[PDB]
Amino acid sequence: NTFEDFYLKRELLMGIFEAGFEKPSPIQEEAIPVAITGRDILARAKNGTGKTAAFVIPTLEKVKPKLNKIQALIMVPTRELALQTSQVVRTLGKHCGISCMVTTGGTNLRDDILRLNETVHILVGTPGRVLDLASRKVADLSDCSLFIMDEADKMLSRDFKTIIEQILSFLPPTHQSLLFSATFPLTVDEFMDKHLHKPYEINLMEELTLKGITQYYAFVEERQKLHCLNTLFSKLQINQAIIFCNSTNRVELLAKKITDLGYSCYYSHARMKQQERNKVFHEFRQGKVRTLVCSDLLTRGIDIQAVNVVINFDFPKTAETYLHRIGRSGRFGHLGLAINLINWNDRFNLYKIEQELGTEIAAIPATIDKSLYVAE
């Protein structure tokens, strides 16, 4: 109900209170008590300040300020995330008397090596620089009983996983591990069976992944949307495409305009009956047409691999919806495109979602490589 329900020390509660947090979110409800126990955690949740707090709060509770050694290591893939994370740490740990330091591949080694001679309780860094400082023995991790990976999937790829294992070699054998990700697939199974011990799993996201899907956006005014869409329809080697709209009416209007444009398509939305929707879905699945126009529809069925281009005619408001539209269920990727039409008012949600899902939505280039959505 409240953060005091977790039996946190006064200063930590003060920090949380000053940050404006009154009611703990689901990720915090799940991760905070378990982490304080000492049990390992493997969590899937969309990125946020509240999630970062979901691991930072336990860290600040466990870390003893009287012990001037690195007691917690937070691994992040990017320097931006390192800065953000450390900001959260210093904010929430304002009254804790706890020191936090960022070390990344960007900053110079000399200054960080000098800084490590001072007291550092919590270390936030990127794999390369951290392994470097650890190998040079500048960073003593003999009492680092807490290990945390945010955006862990970005650091468990073929090359980074080795570095992570090397870094793990420095920590004490009995150490707690908190792993966080926004995408379910993880490359190595032995890594987790070896390094995670009876972990507590948290799954707060829909079982979908944006793996393999190349995502672009395009700054487009409403009046220009149809124009841009048709241009795409001629530019792209579409096999099958699904177009998403934010309301039933817009679905029908867009479908009509598409049909009049000299293109074949179906349409499905929430106002129809389940039978009609199943009919449209089954018909489209058999490749009867090339294009389908949907509103947001719950209970999505079975993945259609023919669909190699998905277009958000209307950009959604939440990451849940974006993932429900674009994401696939396969643990392996899917070679396909996701194209988002961004108006002015959509711009913020373009940023937010991109941050929340830990993905990349770049600006649509002049010409799109065919190797990205066309299979052989």
Binding site: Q224, K225, N230, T231, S247, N249, R250
Partner: peptide
Amino acid sequence: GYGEHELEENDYLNDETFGDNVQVGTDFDF
């Protein structure tokens, strides 16, 4: 065209998108 359902929030600007003056082609520049 056909819409004519109980309108919802994002329908408020459909006239901008599906207006008679709305340009169509393959011209669009990125």
